[PDB]
């Protein structure tokens, strides 16, 4: 009943599969077949959603791509457990 | 919201583990909680992922838990390899 909910879920899935290389605004917008402005707004909402305390993945931006990464507050736990790293 | 950060820890852990996932014991061990506790938390995160706005699901296969994409979004993931 939220018109961009499936759009938002697709963006999450894409970034999830994209992995540590991530995806650019353009790449994301082309897959969804929406404008870049529309895509940005969706990405932003997802980024907001991830900022919630109960969420352990966040949507970061660097090197011209969006990508999913863990929150720094959780590192002590993740260290008890390859993987790919961003510091 | 007393288990929010715990659920966040589980999400973070499963996300980093990849497609090989983690058993209940590993999760319970990292969180330093009982297996029964870990299970309650894993199940709640599973319920959260089943909402339509989430693009990932949590599943149990071969006695491990893992995150994966929902297969209803497959046609967009094809459109990514291309």
């Amino acid at each position: 009943m939220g018109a961009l909910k499936p759009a938002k879920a697709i963006v999450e899935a894409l970034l999830f599969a994209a992995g540590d290389e991530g995806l650019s605004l353009s790449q994301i917008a082309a897959v969804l077949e929406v404008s870049e402005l529309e895509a940005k707004a969706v990405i932003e909402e997802l980024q907001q959603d991830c900022r919630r305390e109960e969420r352990g993945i966040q949507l970061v931006e660097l090197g011209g791509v969006f990508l999913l990464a863990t929150k720094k507050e959780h590192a002590p736990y993740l260290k008890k457990l390859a993987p790919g790293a961003s510091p | 919201g007393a288990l929010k950060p715990a659920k966040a820890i589980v999400e973070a852990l499963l996300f980093a583990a990849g497609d090989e996932g983690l058993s209940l014991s590993q999760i319970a061990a990292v969180l330093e909680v009982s297996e029964l506790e870990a299970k309650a938390v894993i199940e709640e995160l599973q319920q959260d992922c089943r909402r339509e706005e989430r693009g990932i699901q949590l599943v149990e296969l071969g006695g491990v838990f893992l995150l994966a994409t929902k297969k209803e979004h497959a046609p967009y993931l094809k459109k990514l390899v291309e």
């Binding site: 994209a18 790293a85 510091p87 | 990849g18 497609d19």
Partner: peptide
């Protein structure tokens, strides 16, 4: 050194 973990790309597969 603030650690953020990423995960590798998924099953590129056929799709």
């Amino acid at each position: 050194r603030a650690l953020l973990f990423t995960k590798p790309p998924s099953d590129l597969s056929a799709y």
